[PDB]
Write a protein that binds this ligand. Sequence first.
Ligand code: FMN
Ligand code: SF4
Ligand code: SF4
Ligand code: SF4
Ligand code: FES
Ligand code: FES
Ligand code: K
Lengths: 214, 42, 87, 264, 430
Amino acid sequence: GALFVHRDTPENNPDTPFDFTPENYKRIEAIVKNYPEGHQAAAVLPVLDLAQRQNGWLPISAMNKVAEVLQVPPMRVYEVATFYTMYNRKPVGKYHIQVCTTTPCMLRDSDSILETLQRKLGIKVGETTPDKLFTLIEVECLGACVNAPMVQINDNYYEDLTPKDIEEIIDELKAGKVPKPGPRSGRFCCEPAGGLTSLTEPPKGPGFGVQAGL
Amino acid sequence: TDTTTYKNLQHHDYNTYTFLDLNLDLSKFRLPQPSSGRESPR
Amino acid sequence: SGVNNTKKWKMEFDTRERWENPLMGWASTADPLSNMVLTFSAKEDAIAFAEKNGWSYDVEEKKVPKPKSKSYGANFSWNKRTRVSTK
Amino acid sequence: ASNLIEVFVDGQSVMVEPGTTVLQACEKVGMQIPRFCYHERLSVAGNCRMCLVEIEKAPKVVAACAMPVMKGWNILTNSEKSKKAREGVMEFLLANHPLDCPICDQGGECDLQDQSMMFGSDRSRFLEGKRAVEDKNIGPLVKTIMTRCIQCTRCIRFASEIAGVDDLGTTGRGNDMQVGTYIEKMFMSELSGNVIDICPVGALTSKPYAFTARPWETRKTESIDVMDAVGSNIVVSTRTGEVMRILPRMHEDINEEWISDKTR
Amino acid sequence: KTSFGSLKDEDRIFTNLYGRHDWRLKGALRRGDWYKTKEILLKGPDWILGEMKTSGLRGRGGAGFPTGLKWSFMNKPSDGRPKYLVVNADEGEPGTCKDREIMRHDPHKLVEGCLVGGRAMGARAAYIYIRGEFYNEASNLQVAIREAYEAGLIGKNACGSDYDFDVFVVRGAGAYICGEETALIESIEGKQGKPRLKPPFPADVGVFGCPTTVANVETVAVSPTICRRGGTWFAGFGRERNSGTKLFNISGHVNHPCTVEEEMSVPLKELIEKHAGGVTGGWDNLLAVIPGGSSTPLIPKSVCETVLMDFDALVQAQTGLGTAAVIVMDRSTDIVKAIARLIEFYKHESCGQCTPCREGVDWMNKVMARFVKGDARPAEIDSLWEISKQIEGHTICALGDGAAWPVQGLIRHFRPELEDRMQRFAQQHR
Ligand SMILES: Cc1cc2nc3c(=O)[nH]c(=O)nc-3n(C[C@H](O)[C@H](O)[C@H](O)COP(=O)(O)O)c2cc1C
Ligand code: SF4
Ligand code: SF4
Ligand code: SF4
Ligand code: FES
Ligand code: FES
Ligand SMILES: [K+]
């Protein structure tokens, strides 16, 4: 896939304009204050994530800016950004669709979801639409396995997907409205479909079954 | 005591800065951090 | 990192002239006592051989590595400078 | 036996300090545990997994470079479990090690070749294609052929702890993890030839010495460096009456195991 | 008791698993959270550790190590350093959603468990390392934490018990290896997520070099209910040495893929057609089950007929109970494709620090790719078995073991399938 080396380009040279907004600087100060004194170098991942959330992707200038803000080596910053997969070292679209193709999602047939996304967006996996609105990649497990098949778009989880359902999700994204995340098969969450096999009775409440002497 | 309706809808209107802004808001409730005896490990 | 070549004492000779052959440029020499080394189990055995054969000797003491205090927990120290920034 | 503990190696008793590793106990009794990432002057990393040995009444092999002996352990260094672990680790290394021995500057000075002949198997079960890594340009002193790298982090630990530059590191994950600099950075500092010294494979070679001679060709002459006034002990390697290379010497009171770049 | 299962709703701990009730502080107080927490903390550390030991609760992470002993490892006087409780909410394992569900729909139990465990060990802070993809879950956890801070349950007076406690939430960036204990510790410390060797154990050297303890979200969340209702009740549920409730995530080829909370030692069959709605096509259509997440090997139907869901029962069945992820595969499943996809996942998620896992798991990914294609010969099955046995037990963390185990299970059980595939490829080629 991607290459874990850097090449200077006119869009990703170490002179591209990046700087934190003052509210982002306040958030960085909050993260550093959360971490201990003398171990404030542990704030590399949240500050890098904040830089990514500000700028979209993470240029080499943003990496160097995070390094000089945290007084941590730029090589350590590069190590973090290249080890971890949620940091985009290349520009991506406005909507970054991640399709989980791990084994239970494959069992619940996420391959149809992947091929219908490829046909609908007119692109292959790992590439961006020419209008820079959609990037489509395969990923590993995203933590919602009983809700297979599923995608993640930006920070939002779309679950119990049929090809028709992911088509309306893409249509809503193209129209510009919020696609109302969650499962799309009529069930609310991970509960069993067609009835509730547990937790039918109301919860008992405080002071239930408490032992003596407490 | 409604049980037939999903009531987690508060996570639907969450922007890209919700976690960081709430951390910044909550930062005034924390205890002072311990000191490692140095500004940095150098 | 192997240390098996540092177990036996060795006797060598002083190096002499190795000039250049006019014909081929080979390394030509004039001493016979250059390409030889002798192995010994003990420093005093090597010294005894040298004094028996009548050669003036320079003896160098055995350089053994000093024992080191190695600990994997020093790489993650709370306050010391031994904490590493990477792995 | 005050401030001392008794530990057995192959049934032989020895007295060691607390905190002494299994590898340190083995070199105390007189044998050398195989190693690729451990260096006695670098921090303990414990990733190459070559130093796995079997302790008696223990079903899990332990890394000798990191595990400290506690009390009365029996270190079975030449056991069947230890031999199988060494064979597996070496064949895992040589699965993706490139097939570059004749064109390699680490011809006879190869710990990988040596320890492979000594402990590893003699054949390959690898029926796949090897991985290839693009080469870096960290400077005209150190030539980098990073396909040969086995990712032991010796150079990274050396640059972090002794050179103190924090310029080298591991970028990536899994089999695609690459040792070097993320950007095109010139790795020039003091003591920058010692990465060529301590790299066990021929990944970090010497550019002036490149493709010149072989260790069996070179004659070793013990001498003293005079470029500065520290008086560091060196080995001058000369082949056919011509100086070919400068190497350090182990002298703990002067220069330990390293020499300056001007010296080298 | 002899036959297990049929857990009662009043004895179920996670009363808001499906999110049908309010997850905020009002809903938590209605459901019974944060009750007599000050009394718990005034009872103090030794009483809570004794409650855990009488509970016999084991790690829900998949390690299976006794929670009481693991939390009593930090029952020591301080050496001038702080002590930390760390919660693992990474949920990397495929097939598993239970920690995500309980954090999203019931986070005040998690916060109360952080407080209870921190008081039990003796600690000033609990760092909850959540997966980076769980942005909404992390935000909901942060909302609950702010509610607890405003209500005074956390911070400078832990429910008025004169105990200073902090709860931090730190987000990862998508690493199954950062799901691991020590690699999680390094991820919190800010380095790239490579596990560190043991010793030093985290009870001596953890995050920032301080004595820490990494614990699962499910274990931490069932901690305060265990303390409130007693350890004898939790020990009475379940079998001997496998006691209490457990969140099972049943997914794959089942009619209702769901997360349920059920008593331990339930039969796998009874679990499947009691909560999953049965296998798609039926129990005769069932082919294989991975019962304890993708680090555990597969088991066929003939041993799935009467296998229990215990740690010891699955060990006797040559498997393990990990994060209780029951992945079900029917007769139409390409089983070799499923296992090869799992090995590809492990290749993509290995951190690459140590040579056996790095090189060998890449090798096994390539070999199982050729196995799916059929492009091998039957000696390579034994070669792959030897490669897996060389990986297992020679790595730094247990990711190498968790990658070698599914191939070991596939070779042990579905070996005629592989031989038939190679024979089919050979007869079609020539
Ligand atoms: C490679 C690897 C990944 C793991 N990922 C997770 C994870 O995402 N979540 C988790 O709770 N445990 C995970 N574990 C298990 C941890 O060891 C366990 O959570 C931790 O030690 C806490 O112990 P406990 O189970 O007693 O709570 C993982 C283990 C390994 C070897
Ligand atoms: S470093 Fe590799 S290519 Fe070079 S001699 Fe050693 S084994 Fe051969
Ligand atoms: S370049 Fe050499 S010293 Fe550095 S990690 Fe690779 S093999 Fe080790
Ligand atoms: S077993 Fe794999 S994931 Fe674990 S330390 Fe080794 S390379 Fe990393
Ligand atoms: S396997 Fe796809 S979300 Fe877990
Ligand atoms: S020498 Fe111990 S693991 Fe490398
Ligand atoms: K070298």
